[PDB]
Design a protein around this ligand. Structure first.
Ligand SMILES: [Mg+2]
Ligand SMILES: [Mg+2]
Ligand SMILES: [Mg+2]
Length: 223
DNA sequence: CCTGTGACAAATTGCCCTCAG
DNA sequence: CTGAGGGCAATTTGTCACAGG
């Protein structure tokens, strides 16, 4: 049963926001949204090194490294919602540790309604589905794909490439499409195919000499 | 203009070790 | 013993010159 892992349920506004974060910063982001979901919430969240190591198959010393550098790298990271245009900071206070092996973070109290969206306008996935991805961009794509998933784990969706560049905030050399192909599309599609239960194919949409959309579709291995 | 590949750079990976308390 | 530190080589991500349709 896929039901063994936490159920991540985020608003589609988050699924579609424009931001940069590392794999490690996102692994934590999942744990934070879970914890608001279980409370009039105020923004204080807690992380235990020992538990984070259970969850991601890591050693105690390595989990401490990953948390400690992620938490430092939130400084100056804005998140932008869209159309619409609203920019917020993730943390309003620096994180700190009062007990050995435990950190206390203060997430911005305005983001919470953006996490807990309006009814039937939301994305959802088990934590197991995404814990073995490595590339953060491959994590963004798996999120967006999940947004279109029917009850039976199948779906089809067309994303415009300029929109992928803006929301996933991809590096500049990928505006030149042979590089986008080689260092993002093939790498992220292979990863979903090897690390998740999803089975993914795609076709490109040219207009004139240009490529403008990727047309993704997928079934679940439970077929 | 469009494409793919080779090369170099800079970054991320899981892993090894000391050491404090 | 846990976990806060330092460090590593190997691999993957990011940049871009060159050659062909
Ligand atoms: Mg990153
Ligand atoms: Mg609390
Ligand atoms: Mg690491």
């Amino acid at each position: 049963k896929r039901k063994n892992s936490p159920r991540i349920v985020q608003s589609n506004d988050l699924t579609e926001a424009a931001y940069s974060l590392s794999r490690d910063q996102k692994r934590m982001l999942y744990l934070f949204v879970d914890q608001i979901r279980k409370s009039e919430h105020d923004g204080i969240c807690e992380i235990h090194v020992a538990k984070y190591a259970e969850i991601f198959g890591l050693t105690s010393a390595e989990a401490s490294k990953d948390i400690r550098q992620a938490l430092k790298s939130f400084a100056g990271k804005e998140v932008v919602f869209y159309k619409g245009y609203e920019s917020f900071p993730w943390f309003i206070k620096p994180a700190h540790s009062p007990s050995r092996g435990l950190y206390s973070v203060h997430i911005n109290p305005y983001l919470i309604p953006f996490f807990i969206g309006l009814q039937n306008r939301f994305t959802q996935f088990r934590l197991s589905e995404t814990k073995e991805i490595t590339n953060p961009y491959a994590m963004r794509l798996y999120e967006s794909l999940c947004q279109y998933r029917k009850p039976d784990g199948s779906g089809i969706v067309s994303l415009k490439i300029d929109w992928i560049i803006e929301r996933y905030q991809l590096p500049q050399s990928y505006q030149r499409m042979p590089d986008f192909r080689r260092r993002f599309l093939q790498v992220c599609v292979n990863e979903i195919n090897s690390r998740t239960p999803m089975r993914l194919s795609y076709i490109e949409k040219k207009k004139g000499r240009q490529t403008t959309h990727i047309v993704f579709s997928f079934r679940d291995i439970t077929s």
